[PDB]
């Protein structure tokens with residue numbers, strides 16, 4: 419029985435190596451990684467790989483790994499797939515911990531924009547969780563943390579993290595992580611998966627997929643939101659992605675909004691993440 423070496427980038431930035439049989443489905447590898455992480459609330463997470471066009475793809479746990487990675491390396495990342503709107507409802511602290519690590523990367527990467535004050539507050543909870551109570555002995559007037567907090571660090575930001583850290587004395591890691599999440603969950607881009615697209619006129623937009631529905635990001639005076647219930651069907655054809663939008667009560671017919679994606683693979687990717695989000699948040 420022939421086994422393939424898998425390398426998985428974990429949310430702490432470390433690399434986990436394991437083997438699976440070469441005809442293994444994604445679920446096999448995912449189960450191994452989750453056991454390694456002592457993670458039980460697995461439904462919110464997934465593995466990603468980079469395709470031949472270097473796009474992030476979710477590893478489908480139901481399909482053979484080899485038919486997804488195809489010509490590429492068996493190299494993956496462990497990631498949050500479904501960001502819970504209410505992380506306080508998660509059963510386990512360790513689930514909230516992995517969600518925090520994901521969100522820290524979302525912030526540093528600039529995928530999750532955040533005000534100065536919220537960057538400093540989130541950073542102050544991370545420090546409290548990781549180091550415990552504020553200590554002046556490690557932190558002088560010239561202190562810069564090893565913790566990456568933001569896409570662009572300033573001395574201002576470092577000072578504000580310390581000021582807020584001082585206020586968190588006696589806070590345990592689980593408590594600090596829960597505060598981190600109570601703040602992060604409110605950010606307008608929390609758990610929004612963004613896709614580049616053109617509207618039916620050829621104007622460049624962004625489509626965002628998240629718990630509440632589908633968002634269209636245009637000129638920035640116009641953001642359209644379609645709650646999952648208002649979305650009757652989702653489809654793709656060639657480079658095109660279509661959503662059918664329910665009639666307003668006493669309307670005879672549904673409306674169709676068409677979008678142009680970069681290529682067929684990008685349209686299929688968007689369709690699959692929309693279907694998955696619609697199912698997940700319909701049931702949650």
Ligand SMILES: COc1ccc([C@H](N)c2ccccc2)cc1
Pocket residue numbers: 502503504505506507508701702
């Ligand atoms: C992490 O976010 C959630 C997790 C579980 C639920 C679940 N359906 C529920 C609803 C109501 C009361 C208790 C459990 C809901 C949200």
